Homo-oligomer: A and B are copies of this chain.
Amino acid sequence: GFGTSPLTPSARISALNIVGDLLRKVGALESKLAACRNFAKD
């Protein structure tokens, strides 16, 4: 309750690893749903 400390480098690298997984998944979901919307408009 004294404040927030810096994130360790290893924890920062772990969070970066996970955000990579999230960005690959969201990119694929974006492409899938964009294709659904664009196939329908066409």
A residues bordering B, Cβ < 8 Å?
A: 1-13, 15
Identical chains bound together, number: 2
CB-CB < 8 A to A2: which residues of B? Answer: 9, 13
**A to B CB contacts below 8 Å, 8 in the list:** A1-B8, A2-B9, A3-B9, A4-B9, A6-B6, A7-B7, A7-B11, A15-B15
Q: Which of B5, B8, B11 contacts A9 (CB 8 A)?
A: B5
Q: How far is the CA of A11 from the CA of B12 in the complex (A)?
A: 11
> Out of B3, B4, B5, B9, which one reaches A1, CB within 8 Å?
B9
CA–CA, A7 to B9, complex, Å?
7
Name the B residues within 8 Å of A10 (CB-CB). Answer: 1, 4
